[PDB]
C-alpha cells in the first residue's frame, strides 16, 4: 500500500423516486473513487453545502488512507460540532474513504473489518395501511415473499382521526390524536395476533407520538402481543423516563434514529433501557462511529437495528448490510423496496432473498452512483409538512 | 395587538473585521423589521442555505406574534434537530421575532421578560499574551476601564509530524499555573482572574491541574474539559473547591440536563444561538436558577453586536445571571451595527429604547462580504499527531 492523495470531492442529490438522496464522491490521483451516503432527505443542500464548501478544502491532498484521524480531524474541524447537517456531511466522505479502502484491498467492506461473523442479517418490511384489511393484504405479499418479521402501523382512515375534538379556528398543521393512535394501535395487534398467530414478528414505530405517562401506559397493555420491539416510544430527550417502563415491564424497546450527539445514546445504553439501537449511521458521522457504536452496546448486551427508511441511498443500505453480517451483535435489517428508477441510479443494489439480506462480495461497498441516471431525477423540494405535528388543542408534538 | 403577518426573511453575512458575522432579518406586512443572531463563523453558507432554502418557506405568511408556537415547530421541522447548523438558523429567526414583539410593544427587550432584577451586569475582558510582561501591560489598561474581572492567557515529536496546529499539555498546564502564581503575587486580589482551559486536557490532567490552581482561586476555570467528558467532573467537585464554568459548546440539551442536575459546574457557558436563541435561553436560565447555577453567557467577537445587545438584556433580567464577556469592537464593526453599547467602569447597560436596540445597516454590510477562512487552529494536533479537541 502507499498513500492515497484525494483529488476532489463531490455532492450529487438525486431523487428517482420518493426522496432526495444525497451521495459524496472522493476522487484520488490513483483513480480509485469511493461513494457513500449523506442523506438528511429534509435538508439536502445544507448538507450539500457543507461539503462544497467546506469539507472539499480540507480535505483535498489529504491521504485517504488514514480514516480515523481524517474523521477525527473532521468532526472538530468546525469547532462546533455534532448535528445532522455536518455529520451527514461527514459521513459521506467517511464511508466514501472506507469504500476506497475495500477497493484498494481487493475486498468486501465487511472482510475489512475482521470478516462476519453470520452468514446473512434478516430483513423487516413495512406494512402501513389505513384499514386492517389494507395491512392484512400487505402482510400476506411479505409473508410470501418470505419474511419472517413485519413492521404494522394503522394509520388514520382517510388521514383524518375521527371526530377530533379541536378547536373552532385551529392552527394549521397535521393533526392527529394519540389515545385513538393508541387504540388503533392496540386493536391492530390484537387483530393481528388473533389472525396470524406467531407467524411473524410483529414490529411497531410509536415514532415519538406520546407523552411519557401515555408511553407508560402503552407499554404495559401491548406487552401482551410480544412485539419484537416497541420503537421510538419516547423523544430523544425523555429517556430518563424508560426506567419507570423498564421496572415494570418485559417489553422490548428500540429507540434511536434520532440521534446526532453520543449524549443522547450514552447513558441510555449504560443503563441498559433499550434493547436495539436505531442510529441512522450517517446521522452519527458514519462507519468509523458505527463500529465504536456497535463495540459500546455490545458490551452493555445491546443489539443493533440501523435506521434503514426509504430516505437512505442503496449504498448507506449496502454499507448496513456489511455492518450487519459484520458486528457480532446486529441484529435486524430494515427494508423497503427500490422501485425501478432507484435501480436505475444505484446499481447493483441487494435485495432480500427469502427474509435476508446478503452482503456484497465484490472490492468496496459494491454499489456506487449511476451519474448519468441522476442527472435525469434532480433534486426537488419539497415541504413534510408531516413535521408540522399538531394536537388537537393545536400545539406542536415531536413528529 | 392585530396578527403579525411575516412578509419576508434576510440572511446577511458580513465581514467589517476579523470574522464573518451572521445575523437574520425578518420584515413583517406592519413594517416592524426584526433583527437577530445567527452566527456560526465556521460555516457561515451553512446557516445562510438552511435560512434562505429550508426556514423561509416555512415562516413566510405565518403570526409572528406567537414566538413560542414558531419556536417549536422550527426545532423539529427537519425531523432531526439539534446541532450548529440548524440551531443557529432558528435563533437568527427567534431573536428577531422578539425584537419584533418588543418593538410592538413600545419596551426595551428585556422589559417584555419581566424587567431588570439588577440595575447592570458586570463585564470581563481578554487578557492574551505570549509573555507575563503582556499580560500585565493589559491588566493595567483594563484597571485603568474599571474592569474588576479578566480573562488571562498566557518541542518532542516525531519525524515528519501531520500537518496541524501544535501543542504541549505539560507546558501549557505549567505555564498556566506559573501565570496565576505571577498575577496573585503582582495584584493580589485587585481583580477576580478567570482563564478558559479550552478542552485542550485528559481527564487526569484536568483533575491535577484544577487541585493545582484552587489556591489561586479563580473567578472560574473554563472548559476544563470537552463536552463529552464531564462525567469526570464528579472527581473534580468531591476534591477541589475550584470554580467551573462550561458550555459554550453546548447544541443539544442532553449536553447540560445532567450536568446542571448534579450541581457539576457553577457557571453555565452556552452560546445563546447555538441553543436555538432567546426562547431556549430563558428556559435554561430558569432550569439553572432551581439548581443554583449561575449564568455566563458566551460572548466571543465571532457574535454579532446584536446578539450582545440580546445577551444584555437577558444578564438584567435572569436573576441568575453572573457576568458578561466582552471583547471591543473595530469602527468598521461599529459602523455596520449603529449604537452598540460599551462598557461603562466594567458594567454593560441594556439598551432602553424599543427591541433589542441594535440592528443592521444592511448599506454598510454590503462593503464588507463573506470572506471564506481555514480556521487552521480547530486543526489542534498533540506531538505525537493525534488530533485533540481544539
Ligand atoms: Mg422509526
Ligand atoms: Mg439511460
Ligand atoms: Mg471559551
Same mark, same amino acid.
Given at each position: ?41 429534509? +435538508? ?35 469547532? *462546533? ?9 461527514? %459521513?459521506?466522505?467517511? #464511508? ?9 484491498? =481487493? ?74 393512535? #393508541? ?9 393481528? +395476533? ?12 410509536? !415514532? ?12 404495559? $397493555?401491548? $406487552? ?16 430518563? *423516563?424508560?426506567?419507570?417502563? &423498564?421496572?415494570?415491564? %418485559?417489553? %422490548? ?11 443522547? *445514546? ?5 443503563? &441498559?433501557?433499550?434493547?436495539?439501537? &436505531? ?21 452493555? =448486551?445491546?443489539?443493533?437495528? *440501523? !435506521? ?7 449504498? =448507506?443500505?449496502?454499507?448496513?448490510? !456489511? ?36 452482503? %456484497? ?23 413534510? $409538512? ?10 406542536? !408534538?415531536?413528529?
Amino acid at each position: 500500500l502507499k498513500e492515497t492523495i484525494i483529488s476532489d470531492i463531490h455532492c450529487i442529490i438525486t431523487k428517482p423516486d420518493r426522496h432526495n438522496l444525497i451521495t459524496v464522491v472522493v476522487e484520488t490521483n490513483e483513480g480509485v473513487t469511493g461513494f457513500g451516503c449523506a442523506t438528511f432527505q429534509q +435538508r439536502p443542500l445544507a448538507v450539500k453545502t457543507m461539503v462544497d464548501e467546506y469539507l472539499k478544502p480540507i480535505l483535498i491532498g489529504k491521504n485517504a488512507n488514514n480514516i480515523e484521524d481524517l474523521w477525527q480531524m473532521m468532526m472538530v474541524n468546525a469547532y *462546533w460540532r455534532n448535528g445532522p447537517v455536518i455529520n451527514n456531511a461527514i %459521513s459521506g466522505v467517511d #464511508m466514501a474513504l472506507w469504500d476506497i479502502k475495500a477497493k484498494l484491498a =481487493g475486498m468486501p467492506l465487511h472482510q475489512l473489518f475482521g470478516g462476519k461473523s453470520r452468514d446473512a442479517i434478516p430483513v423487516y418490511t413495512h406494512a402501513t395501511s389505513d384499514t386492517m384489511e389494507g395491512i392484512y393484504d400487505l402482510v400476506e405479499g411479505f409473508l410470501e415473499k418470505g419474511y419472517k418479521h413485519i413492521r404494522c402501523q394503522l394509520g388514520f382512515y382517510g388521514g383524518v382521526p375521527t371526530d377530533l375534538h379541536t378547536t373552532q379556528n385551529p392552527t394549521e398543521g397535521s393533526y392527529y390524536d394519540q389515545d385513538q393512535y #393508541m387504540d388503533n394501535t392496540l386493536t391492530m395487534f390484537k387483530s393481528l +395476533r388473533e389472525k396470524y398467530g406467531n407467524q411473524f414478528h410483529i414490529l411497531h414505530d410509536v !415514532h415519538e407520538r406520546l407523552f411519557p405517562n401515555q408511553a407508560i401506559q402503552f407499554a404495559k $397493555e401491548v $406487552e401482551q402481543y410480544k412485539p419484537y420491539f416497541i420503537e421510538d416510544i419516547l423523544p430523544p430527550n425523555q429517556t430518563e *423516563w424508560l426506567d419507570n417502563i &423498564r421496572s415494570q415491564s %418485559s417489553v %422490548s424497546l428500540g429507540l434511536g434514529e434520532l440521534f446526532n450527539n453520543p449524549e443522547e *445514546w450514552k447513558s441510555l445504553i449504560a443503563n &441498559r433501557r433499550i434493547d436495539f439501537i &436505531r442510529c441512522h449511521v450517517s446521522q452519527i458521522g458514519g462507519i468509523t462511529p458505527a463500529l465504536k457504536l456497535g463495540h459500546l452496546c455490545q458490551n452493555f =448486551g445491546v443489539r443493533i437495528a *440501523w !435506521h434503514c427508511p426509504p430516505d437512505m441511498t442503496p449504498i =448507506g443500505a449496502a454499507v448496513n448490510t !456489511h455492518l450487519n453480517v459484520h458486528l457480532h451483535n446486529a441484529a435486524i435489517q430494515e427494508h423497503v423496496e427500490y422501485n425501478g428508477n432507484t435501480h436505475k441510479v444505484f446499481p447493483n443494489a441487494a435485495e432480500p432473498i427469502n427474509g435476508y439480506l446478503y452482503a %456484497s462480495e465484490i472490492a468496496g461497498i459494491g454499489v456506487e452512483i449511476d451519474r448519468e441516471a441522476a442527472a435525469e431525477f434532480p433534486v426537488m423540494y419539497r415541504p413534510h $409538512e408531516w413535521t408540522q405535528s399538531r394536537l388537537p388543542d393545536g400545539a406542536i !408534538h415531536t413528529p
